[PDB]
Structure formats: C-alpha cells, structure tokens
C-alpha cells in the first residue's frame, strides 16, 4: 500500500518546482522535506504520495469541539499515514500522535526589517511603537500563550489584544509584513526559517538576539502505526550519516542570494 | 517498587557532595541530572534510588562477546530501570533500549588550551604537531570510528594509530591533558561539556569552531518498560516549562568561575 505523506508548503521545506507545469505527482515538489521523504521511504522500503495538508495548518486542537486540524489532524483521523514537515515535537501532540527523534533542532527567534532599533525580546516588550506577532495554529503562538516568563508573558498580553491582529496565516504573510512595515513590525518565528529568509533577497531582514527556547522537528505518525519504529531508526541513521547536515547546507546557504 | 536509576559521575551532571560521607542515599549526590531525576520522578509519580554505574561507562556492545557494558548494559540486563545521565541518543542504542525525546541538544566540539593555533576540525586533520583524541569508549569515539566523511575519517585514522594513546578514560583526564600540554594536545568532546569547562578555573581552555555534528541526550529505559511513555511526556513538559534551560544556567553559568 502506497503511503500517504501529508506535508505543507513552507520554503525551503516544500516548494513547487519552477517547471512543475510539465511535471506530475511527487516530481512537482522540491525542498528539504522532499529530499528527506525520499530518503526515509528508501530506508524504510515503501512507496509514497506527497499531499499538501488540506487546511494549510500544522496542527492544533479546537478548545470547544476537541477536534484536531492541520497535519496533526490528518494523522489523528487517518487521512494521512505520516507527516514529513517542519512539525514541532510538543507535549500536546505527543499525547495523540507519535514523533520520531528530532531531524532538526531550533528555537523561536526575532526577525526585524533592518535598521529596526530592536535587539531582544525584552526590547520588544519595553516599547509599543513597534508591533510584533507570530504565526497561527502553531507552536510559536502557543509558546507565548503558555509562557510564565515575565518578558514573554508581557509580550503575549500585548499580542493577544493587539489591534489589528498581529498574527498571520502563513510565514510568507509575516515576512511580507515585516518588509513593508517600514520597520514598524517585528516577526517572531522559528530560527531555521529566520535564517533562511535572511539569505533571500531583497536581503532586507535579519535575525536578532538568541533563541527564546529549544525544540526540534520530528516526523509524525499516528499512534500504533507499523511505520513508527522504522521511521525513527531511519531519522537517526540519516543524521548519523551526516545527510541531514548535507540537506540543510543545500537548501539554506548553497542557494542563499545575499 | 522503588525505581533503580543508573547514572554516571560526570561533572556537573552528577557529583559527590562535599560531605557525602555524612549523608545517605540520594542525598549523597548533586548536579544537573540529580536535579532532573528528582523532577522526572515527581512528575511520573515514582520513588527512586540513584546508583552509579558499576563500570563507569556509558554503553557499547563488545563485538565478539556481544555483551553491552555501561549504563546501557545495566538497562539491557535489567540491573537498572532507567538511566538519567548525559547519554547520547544513537541508532545502535535505540535498537536495544528506548530513549525519551532529548532533554539537551549538543554536538561534538574542539577544546583547546588558549592560544593553540587551531580553529576547526579541518585544521586538526591537516597538521600533526598538535595531538588530539577523545573520551575512550563513548559515542564521540564511535562517531569518528564510523564516519565516512573525509575530514573525520582522516582524523580517525590518525587517532586510532597514535602512540601513546590519544584517548582518555575520563573527561577530567582529557581536560587535564589539554591543560598540561602547552598547546600540543586538543580534545574532542561534547559541546555542553566543553562549555562547562570553559567556565571553570584556571579558565585556560576554550571551545573553537562549530560543532562537528548535532544530536541530543535522552532519558533511557529498557524496551517494553512501563515507565517509557510517562518519562517521555515529563521531559517534554519540563522543557516546555523552561526547567531544562533553568538547570543548565544553574550548573553552568550561575556557578561560573571565569
Ligand atoms: N513548527 C510549528 C509551525 N511554525 C512554523 C514557523 Br516557520 C513559525 O515561525 N512558527 C510556528 O509555530 C508547528 O509545528 O506548529
Ligand atoms: N554522551 C556519550 C559519552 N561522552 C561524553 C562526553 Br562529556 C564526551 O566528550 N564524549 C562522549 O562520548 C555517550 O552517551 O556515550
Ligand atoms: Zn540514504
Ligand atoms: Zn472552534
Ligand atoms: Zn516539576
């Protein structure tokens, strides 16, 4: 049985090739996770079909209905067999799906235009002339919602009631907002993404300060999946072979344009 | 029943308290992993007994005898129920025991006596005046033994054949060797340990270059253990609540001597 892989369009993890018009199936896509999927499938010995998550979300549980959305939801309800994407390993998700050991390490970071008078999270929390937000239905927004750290909690009380909404549906929207806000908007996002964007023209953004936390991305499978064990050992093998480092250089700096 | 925890004397994870002869049981020890063990036990709801691994090793399988030694061996043969220490999550180990998601991220790094003209692994491999080695019998040594990467294999070729041995029995032994070498010995060790030593008197060592790889430490349990699931969720909860960052600051920098 062909394995249904759920993923999300997030550069440089999964992007449609420039010549996708003449391509079909998994060939239409390219990116870090596309290469990863091929490796995993090869080592675990299975055939697969890459599918972009229906609602374009990573995964969160509806407080009122208790229904899971995003890629997590597709695994939970059996719409997909495995998720290969920049999906953060978290406690709430681990309670409903399985995660392989991390294939990438990262942390929340700050993205600023360039010339923006901000160097840390504390700086952002000390002023109000510059707005800031995060992505939606993701671990970043949840981080601030659950954080007890003085600075992070203060930032949340602002973002929560901010008008207009400082949250964005997609990373692209957030980066675009930073670039066109004359430096009046800072974006909080996962470090790996921040670093990628800093190497993309117009080369007008930059990562400032250290990461606010430590976390990792993992390959997810529904609980009780016959793929779980094999996939986990596959990720470890690939990391130990140095393939994962090989893949990040390829998509992050070998293609950098700054 | 009381849970038997195997761990290892490796500063600052587990250390003998100054007046340990005056104390009993778990109170004889102090450190990052001692603090972590208490927290894992509280959150998982079990009583425990800290024990220091008999052979003072982390864990490897002897080719020929097929017997596992170190903390891994204590779990494999049922001498301990859980291992809470700076134990690296590796494929070969994952095949015989279970690991929680990582509680600490790190990579192999280079430690030099201040002033040593070395800035990378490539630098080390391209010269011979400066000797270098690793902790014997651990995942760092195995990384070089198993690596297929040119630079790292070249380093392995030299280290395995060096006489006298460039390998050391304990981290302290390696650090002392760097300190007494007048710059003629560099030490390859896990990054977080390198960082710890850099903050200890006489403040004569430092970490140089980037990490050679990326991996993490995990809490280990025997396969099929009834504790596995709970321990994993506890680690994720503790990381998300910021405790792990708190513990590193406490044992690394709050007590920094440089
Ligand atoms: N990895 C997250 C999604 N995600 C992604 C990016 Br990029 C970001 O900046 N913030 C997030 O929460 C998850 O798994 O929810
Ligand atoms: N973490 C390793 C042990 N270990 C420890 C230190 Br500190 C080091 O520098 N190298 C190692 O291999 C393992 O699990 O074998
Ligand atoms: Zn391969
Ligand atoms: Zn709702
Ligand atoms: Zn606690």
- CA-nearest residue for atom 3, ligand 1, is A138
Residues with Cβ within 8 Å of residue B69, at least 6 apart in sequence: B55, B57, B59, B60, B62, B137
**CA distance readout (Å), B16 to B3, B8, B12, B176, B197:** 21, 11, 10, 20, 18
Q: Is A171 in the pocket of ligand 1 (CB under 6 A)?
A: yes
Task: Compute the distance between CA of residue B163 and CA of residue A153 in angstroms, rounded to an integer.
Answer: 57
- 10 Å CB burial of residue A157 (0-12, 13-18, 19+) is exposed
Q: Measure Cα distances from B187 to A241, B99, B130, B172 in Å.
A: 23, 28, 10, 11
Tokens encoding A169: 């549906």
Q: Which of A169, A171, A176 is nearest to A191 (CA)?
A: A171
**Of B59, B101, B66, B102, which is closest to residue B80 (Cα–Cα)?**
B59
For residue A170, the CA-to-ligand 1 centroid distance in Å is 9
Q: Which tokens hold the place of A1?
A: 């049985």
Report how far residue B177's alpha carbon sits from residue B199's, in angstroms, rounded to the nearest whole number. 17
C-alpha distances (whole Å) from B41 to each of A26, A66, B20, B79, B210 are 46, 30, 22, 18, 35
User: How far apart, in whole angstroms, are the C-alpha atoms of residue A58 and residue A69?
Assistant: 8
Give the separation between CA A187 and CA A173, rounded to whole angstroms: 10
Angle at B103 between CA A207 and CA A125, to 5 degrees: 35
Torsion of CA A235, A237, A241, A244, to 10 degrees: 0
CA A64–ligand 4 middle distance (angstroms): 5
**Distance, CA of B128 to CA of B220 (rounded, Å):** 39
Buried b (16+ CB within 10 A) or exposed e, A23-57: eeebebbbbbbbbbbebbbeebebebebeebeeeb
The residue of chain A with its CA nearest to that of B101 is: A101
Q: What are A106's strand-pairing partners?
A: A215
Of B46, B68, B71, the closest CA to residue B57 belongs to B71
Q: Which fold has domain B107-215?
A: D-Maltodextrin-Binding Protein; domain 2 (3.40.190)
Q: How far apart are CA A194 and CA A188, in angstroms?
A: 9
Q: Which residue, among B213, B188, B209, B207, has the nearest Cα to B252 in the 3D structure?
A: B207
Residue A21: exposed, middle, or buried by beta-carbon count in 10 A (0-12, 13-18, 19+)? exposed
Length of chain A: 258
Between chains, do B215 and A239 touch, taking CB under 8 Å as contact? yes
Distances (CA, A) of B110 to A108, A193, B192: 27, 28, 11
Phi and psi at residue A64, to the nearest 5°: -80, -45
Strand partners, B205: B113
Distance CA A214, CA A105 (A): 7
User: CA-to-CA distance for A222 and A79, rounded, in angstroms?
Assistant: 10
Which structural technique was applied?
X-ray
Helix (H), strand (E), coil (C) string for chain A: CCEEEEECCECCCEEECCCHHHCCHHHHEECHHHHHHHHHHHHHCCCEEEEECCCCCCCCECCCCCCECHHHHHHHCCCCCEECCCCECCHHHHCCEEECCCCEEECEEEEECCCCCCCCHHHHHHCCCCEEECECCCHHHHHHHHCCCHHHHHHHHHHHHCCCCCCECCHHHHHHHHHCCCCCEEEEEEHHHHHHHHCCCCCCCEEECCCCCCEEECCEEECCCCCHHHHHHHHHHHHHHCHHHHHHHHHHCCCCCC
Phi-psi region of B64 (alpha: psi -120 to 50; beta: other; left: phi over 0): left
Q: How far is the CA of A66 from the centre of ligand 4 (A)?
A: 8
For tokens 């001597």, what's the residue?
A: B257
Interface residues from chain B to A (CB-CB < 8 Å)? 89-91, 94-95, 99, 101-102, 105, 143, 146-149, 213-216, 218, 232-233, 236-237, 239-242, 244-245
Q: What torsion do the CA atoms of B243, B213, A106, A86 make, to the nearest 10 degrees? A: -130
Identify the CA nearest to A178 among candidates A170, A187, A165: A187
Q: How far apart are CA A114 and CA A20, in angstroms?
A: 34
CA A139 / ligand 1 centre spacing (Å): 6
Give Cα B58 distance to the centre of its chain: 8
Do the Cβ atoms of B256 and B199 come closer than 8 Å?
yes
Contact status, residue B191 vs residue B108, Cβ threshold 8 Å? yes
Pick the ligand that lies closest to the CA of residue B11.
2
Domain extents in chain A: 1-106+216-255, 107-215
Residue closest to B166 by CA, chosen among B143, B138, B136:
B136
* Cis-peptide into A108, omega within 30 deg: no
Q: Give this entry's resolution in angstroms.
A: 1.8
Closest Cβ opposite residue A90 in set B149, B213, B236: B236
Cβ separation of A242 and B149 shorter than 8 Å?
A: yes
Name every chain B residue with its beta carbon within 8 A of the beta carbon of A95.
233
In angstroms, the CA A16 to CA A19 distance is 8
Which of B44, B91, B104 should we substitute to test contact with A (largest number of A Cβ atoms within 10 Å)? B91
Residues found in chain B: 258
DSSP string, chain B: -PEEEEE--BTTTBEE-TTGGG--GGGGEESHHHHHHHHHHHHHT--EEEEE-TT-----B-TTT--B-HHHHHHHTTS-SEE-SS-B--HHHHTTEEEPSPSEEE-EEEEEETT-S--SHHHHHT-SSSEEEEBTTSHHHHHHHH--SHHHHHHHHHHHH-SS---BSSHHHHHHHHHHTTTSEEEEEEHHHHHHHTTSTT--EEEES--S--EEE--EEETT-SSHHHHHHHHHHHHHTTHHHHHHIIIIITT---
- Measured between CB atoms, which of B94, B237, B245 is closest to A91? B237
User: Is residue A200 packed enough to be buried (19+ CB in 10 Å), middle (13-18) or exposed (0-12)?
Assistant: middle
Atom of ligand 1 at shortest range from CA of A108: 9
B190 annotated ligand binder:
yes
How many Cα atoms occupy the beta-carbon half-sphere of B219 within 13 Å?
A: 26
What is the rounded distance in angstroms from the CA atom of residue A189 to the CA atom of residue A85?
16
Calculate how close chain B gets to A101, using CA atoms only, in Å: 6
Contact B128, B154 (CB under 8 A): no
Beta-carbon pairs below 8 A across chains A and B: 68
A10-20 burial code (b ≥16 CB/10 A, e <16): bbbbbbeeeee
Which residue from B94, B95, B102 is facing A102, i.e. has the nearest CB?
A: B102
Q: Is B216 close to A245, i.e. CB distance below 8 A?
A: no
The CA–CA distances, whole Å, from A115 to A107, A145, A155, A179, A186 equal 23, 29, 21, 12, 12
If one residue of A32, A137, A140 were mutated to test the ligand 1 pocket, choosing by the most ligand atoms within 8 A of its CB, it would be A140
Check for a shared fold between A1-106+216-255 and A107-215. yes
The answer to whether A49 touches A38, Cβ cutoff 8 Å, is no
B139 is an annotated ligand-binding site residue: yes
Q: Is B155 exposed, middle or buried (0-12, 13-18, 19+ CB in 10 A)?
A: buried
Q: What is the largest CA-CA distance in chain A?
A: 56
Which residue's CA is the nearest one to ligand 2's atom 3? B138
Whether the bond between B12 and the residue before it is cis, its omega within 30 degrees of 0, is yes
Q: List Cβ neighbours of A36 (8 Å cut-off, separation of 6 or more).
A: A84, A103, A219, A238, A244, A247
Q: Peptide bond before A164: cis, by omega within 30 degrees of 0?
A: yes
User: Which of A87, A240, A253 should we substitute to test contact with B (largest number of B Cβ atoms within 10 Å)?
Assistant: A240
Report domain B1-106+216-255's class.
alpha beta
User: Can you tell me which atom of ligand 2 is nearest the CA of B135?
Assistant: 10
Among B89, B147, B240, beta carbon nearest to A91: B240
Assigned token pair, A199 = 């190497």
Rounded Cα distance between B15 and B27, Å, is 11
Binary contact (A214, B89; C-beta < 8 A):
no
The dihedral through the CA atoms of B78, B81, B86, B87 has a sign that is positive
């Amino acid at each position: 049985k062909t394995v249904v892989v759920t993923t999300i369009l997030e550069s440089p993890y999964v992007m449609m090739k420039k010549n996708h018009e003449m391509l079909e199936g998994n060939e239409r896509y390219e990116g870090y996770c596309v290469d990863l999927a091929a490796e995993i499938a090869k080592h675990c010995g299975f055939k697969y079909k890459l599918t972009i998550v229906g609602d374009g979300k990573y995964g969160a549980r509806d407080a009122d209905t208790k229904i899971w959305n995003g890629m997590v939801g597709e695994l939970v309800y059996g719409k997909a067999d495995i998720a290969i994407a920049p999906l953060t390993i978290t406690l709430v998700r681990e309670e409903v799906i399985d995660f392989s050991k991390p294939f990438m390490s990262l942390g929340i970071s700050i993205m600023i235009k360039k010339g923006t008078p901000i160097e840390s999270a504390e700086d952002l929390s000390k002023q109000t002339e510059i707005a800031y937000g995060t992505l939606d239905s993701g671990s970043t927004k949840e981080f601030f919602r659950r954080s007890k750290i003085a600075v992070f909690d203060k930032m949340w009380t602002y973002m929560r009631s901010a008008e207009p909404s400082v949250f964005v549906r997609t990373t692209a929207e957030g980066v675009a907002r930073v670039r066109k806000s004359k430096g009046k908007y800072a974006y909080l996002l996962e470090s790996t993404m921040n670093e990628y964007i800093e190497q993309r023209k117009p080369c007008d953004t930059m990562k400032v300060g250290g990461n606010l936390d430590s976390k990792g991305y993992g390959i997810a499978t529904p609980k009780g999946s016959s793929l779980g064990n094999a996939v986990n050992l596959a990720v470890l093998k690939l990391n130990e072979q140095g393939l994962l480092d090989k893949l990040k250089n390829k998509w992050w700096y070998d293609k950098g344009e700054c």
